[PDB]
Amino acid sequence: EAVRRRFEELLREALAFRERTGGRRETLEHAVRLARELAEFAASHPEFNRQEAVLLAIELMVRAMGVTMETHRSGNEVKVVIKGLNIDEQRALYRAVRETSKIMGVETEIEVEGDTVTIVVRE
C-alpha cells in the first residue's frame, strides 16, 4: 500500500510537471528522476511485489512523458509496448528500465524498433 501510495503521489507530480514543462528534454529528465525515486522507495519496502514495482516505474515514465502504452499479460510475464518515442527518450527509457530492474532484482527484456520500445517483465 505504501508503495502504491507513493506511485500516486509521484504520478500527480508527473502530470503537473508536463503541464508546465518547457520541452520533451526537460520532461524526460524529470521522468527518469521520478522513476528512480519510486524504484528506490519500493526497494525499501521488500514486502511489495518486485515485478509490479518495475511496471509502476515504467508507467510513471509513460505518464510523465505523455506517450502511448499497451499492456498484455501472458501468465507470469507482462509485456509493455511504448510508442512514439524519440531517440533521446528511447535511450533514457532503456537506461531507466535497466536500472530499475537491477534495483528490484527483476529480469526484464527490452526491444527497440522504430519509435516503439517493447518491455517484457518476467516473474
Residue numbers in the entry: 2 to 124
Pull text from the paper.
Several natural systems exhibit ‘facilitated dissociation’, in which an effector (E) can bind to a target–host (TH) complex to form an excited ternary complex (THE)20–26 from which the target dissociates quickly. We set out to design protein systems that undergo facilitated dissociation. We use a switchable target binder (host) and a flexible effector that can rapidly bind to and switch the target–host complex to induce a large steric clash with the target, forming a strained excited ternary complex. We show here that by explicitly considering excited intermediate states when designing coupled protein systems, a broad range of facilitated dissociation systems can be designed.
To allosterically couple binding of the effector to dissociation of the target, we designed structured fusions of the hinge switch and binder such that when the switch is in state X, the target can bind, but when in the effector-bound state Y, it will clash strongly. To measure facilitated dissociation kinetics, we used surface plasmon resonance (SPR): with the target affixed to the SPR surface, we incubated with the host, then measured target–host dissociation under flow of various concentrations of effector. For these four designs, the target dissociates slowly in the absence of the effector; adding the effector increases the rate of dissociation markedly, but minimally affects the target off-rate from a control static binder fusion that lacks an effector-binding site.
